[PDB]
Design a protein around this ligand. Structure first.
Ligand code: HEM
Lengths: 430, 55
C-alpha cells in the first residue's frame, strides 16, 4: 500500500508492491468528454493505432505488452514489462509519443485501423445491448453536454475522420500539463523518476488544452424499441455524485444496498436484499445491477436490468423504485451494515487485483482529478463512518421526487411512459 | 293507465318505474363498457391504436 506522486517537469505517480510484472504508461486528462459531436471517436481511434500490428510487433520483439483504455474524463496508454525491463518500456513510450507519432499515421496503417474500429463499433451497436443501453443512458441524461458523447464514438463521426483530426486532437490534449506518467507493478518511485529525469526535452510545454462548458443532467429518455430482440434491457438513473463529492461513498453504499442479481445463480437468490422478495415470485427479470458512476463534473446513480418477462416490466420498475423510496424514509441499520461490508469487499477486489494494468488505470484517473490517491484503508474509514442518517439525507436530496433518465432496447412496449416512472420516485403522505 | 284515463294509478306507477329504470341503465352502461374494453377506443385517424398506447 503506497502512493508516491512527485512533479519534476512532468507529474510522476507510482504505487509499488512486490508482485511479478511492472506496468508503465502515460494517462492524459482528456477523454471522450473533450471531443465534439463531429470528431467523436478520435480518442478510440488513437487507442487503436497505438495497438496496431505495426506498433504491437515492435513491442513484442522487445518482450513488451500493450494496453490502452478510453474513458470519459481521461485516456491512457500503457506498456507492461518484466520488471527489470522498466527502462525498455520508457523507451517504447517515447519512441512512440515523439518519434513514431508521425510514423504511426501512415496511409495504409490508418485505413486498415479505421476499417477495424468501424467493424468494431458496428458490432457493438448490433449486439452488445446492455452496454449499448448504458451508453445511450449517458447520451440522453447528459445531452448537448460533454458527458453525452460515447467513448467508442459514433459510426458517422468515425467514418468521416481523417489523419488531421487525430493530429489536431493530439496537439491539443497530449500536452504536458494534461499528462501524468504512471508506474505500477513492483518498481520503485526513484527507480522510475530518475529514468524520466534522465532525458530532458519538454515538448510543447506551456500549452494548455481548450476550455469548454459544464456538464448537466437533464431528466429525459431514449427508447430504442426492437421487437425482434428476445429480451428487454433497461437502465434508469438519477443525477449521482462527481468524484471528490462529500457523498461519493454514501452514494456507492446506497447502490450496494440493492446490489446486483442473477436469477440463475442459486447464491444470488439468497442475498439480504428486500427487493428480491418482490421480484422472484413472478420472476420479473433475469438480472439487474445498481451502480454509482462518478465523473469529474457529475455522475449517475441508478440500475440496469434485463428481462424476458415482457408483460410485467411495469412491476419490475415499480418494485425497484419503491425500494429506492425506502432510502429516504425507512432504510434499516442492518441494511446499511450489510452494505458497508460488501462495499469494502468489492472496493478491495478492485484496488488490489493481481493485475497492474488495472492498478495503473485506477491510480492514473484518481491523481488526474484530485492530485492524489486516497488509500484503501482511508476509504474504509470513510465507509465505516456512514450512518443511516447520512443515507437518508443523501437519498432525500438525490432520489426523492427527482427527475430520472431512462434508456432501453428490445421488447420495451411494456415499459410505461415517463411520468408513470417519474411519479414512483416518491410516495403519498398525510 | 290502470283505468279509464291518466289518473292516480298512472302517476304512482310512473314514479315507481322512474325510480327503477336508471338502475337498468346502469347495468347497460356496464355492458357498454365491457364491449368497449375488449377492443378499446378508436381514434380520430380511424386506424389502429396498437402501435402507440399511453395509460
Ligand atoms: C349513459 C350513456 C352512455 C355512457 C355512460 C357511455 C360511456 C362511454 C364511454 C366511457 C366510452 C369511452 C370514451 C368515449 O369514447 O367517449 C364510450 C364509447 C362509445 N360509446 Fe358510449 N356511452 C353511453 C351511451 C352511448 C350511446 C347512446 C351510444 C350510441 C348510440 C354510444 C356509443 C359508443 C361508441 C360507439 C363508443 C366508441 C367510440 C370510439 O372509441 O370511437 N354510447 N361510451
Amino acid at each position: 500500500a503506497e502512493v508516491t506522486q512527485l512533479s519534476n517537469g512532468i507529474v510522476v505517480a507510482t504505487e509499488h508492491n512486490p508482485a511479478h510484472t511492472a506496468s508503465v504508461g502515460v494517462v492524459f486528462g482528456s477523454g471522450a468528454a473533450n471531443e465534439n459531436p463531429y470528431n467523436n471517436g478520435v480518442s478510440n481511434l488513437w487507442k487503436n493505432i497505438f495497438l496496431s500490428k505495426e506498433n504491437s510487433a515492435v513491442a513484442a520483439k522487445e518482450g513488451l505488452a500493450l494496453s490502452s483504455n478510453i474513458s470519459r474524463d481521461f485516456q491512457s496508454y500503457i506498456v507492461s514489462s518484466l520488471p527489470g525491463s522498466t527502462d525498455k518500456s520508457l523507451d517504447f513510450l517515447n519512441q512512440s509519443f515523439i518519434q513514431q507519432k508521425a510514423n504511426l499515421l501512415s496511409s495504409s496503417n490508418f485505413e486498415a485501423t479505421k476499417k477495424s474500429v468501424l467493424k468494431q463499433v458496428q458490432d457493438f451497436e448490433d449486439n452488445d445491448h446492455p452496454n449499448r443501453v448504458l451508453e445511450h443512458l449517458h447520451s440522453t441524461a447528459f445531452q448537448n453536454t460533454p458527458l453525452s458523447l460515447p467513448t467508442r464514438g459514433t459510426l458517422e463521426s468515425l467514418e468521416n475522420l481523417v489523419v488531421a483530426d487525430l493530429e489536431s486532437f493530439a496537439n491539443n490534449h497530449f500536452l504536458n500539463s494534461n499528462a501524468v506518467v504512471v508506474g505500477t507493478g513492483n518498481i520503485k518511485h526513484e527507480d522510475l523518476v530518475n529514468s524520466i529525469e534522465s532525458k530532458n526535452l519538454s515538448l510543447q510545454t506551456g500549452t494548455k488544452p481548450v476550455l469548454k462548458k459544464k456538464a448537466a443532467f437533464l431528466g429525459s429518455e431514449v427508447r430504442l424499441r426492437d421487437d425482434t430482440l428476445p429480451k428487454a434491457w433497461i437502465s434508469l438513473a438519477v443525477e449521482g455524485e462527481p468524484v471528490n463529492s462529500p457523498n461519493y461513498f454514501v452514494a456507492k453504499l446506497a447502490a450496494q444496498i440493492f446490489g446486483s442479481y442473477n436469477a440463475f445463480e442459486p447464491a444470488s437468490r439468497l442475498q439480504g436484499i428486500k427487493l428480491l422478495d418482490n421480484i422472484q415470485e413472478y420472476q420479473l427479470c433475469d438480472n439487474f445491477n445498481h451502480f454509482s458512476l462518478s465523473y469529474k463534473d457529475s455522475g449517475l446513480w441508478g440500475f440496469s436490468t434485463a428481462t424476458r418477462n415482457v408483460t410485467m416490466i411495469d412491476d419490475l420498475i415499480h418494485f425497484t423504485l419503491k425500494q429506492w423510496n425506502r432510502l429516504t424514509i425507512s432504510v434499516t441499520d442492518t441494511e446499511v451494515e450489510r452494505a458497508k461490508s460488501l462495499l469494502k469487499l468489492q472496493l478491495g477486489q478492485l484496488y488490489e487485483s493481481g493485475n497492474p494494468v488495472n492498478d495503473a488505470n485506477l491510480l492514473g484517473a484518481e491523481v488526474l482529478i484530485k492530485g492524489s490517491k486516497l488509500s484503501l484503508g482511508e476509504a474504509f474509514k470513510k465507509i465505516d463512518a456512514i450512518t443511516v442518517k447520512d443515507v437518508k439525507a443523501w437519498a432525500g436530496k438525490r432520489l426523492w421526487d427527482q427527475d430520472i433518465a431512462i434508456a432501453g432496447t428490445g421488447q420495451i412496449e411494456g415499459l410505461l411512459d415517463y411520468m408513470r416512472i417519474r411519479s414512483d420516485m416518491s410516495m403519498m403522505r398525510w | 293507465w290502470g283505468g279509464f284515463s291518466v289518473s292516480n294509478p298512472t302517476i304512482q306507477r310512473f314514479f315507481a318505474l322512474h325510480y327503477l329504470v336508471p338502475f337498468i341503465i346502469a347495468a347497460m352502461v356496464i355492458m357498454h363498457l365491457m364491449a368497449l374494453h375488449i377492443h378499446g377506443s378508436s381514434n380520430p385517424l380511424g386506424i389502429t391504436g396498437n402501435l402507440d398506447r399511453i395509460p
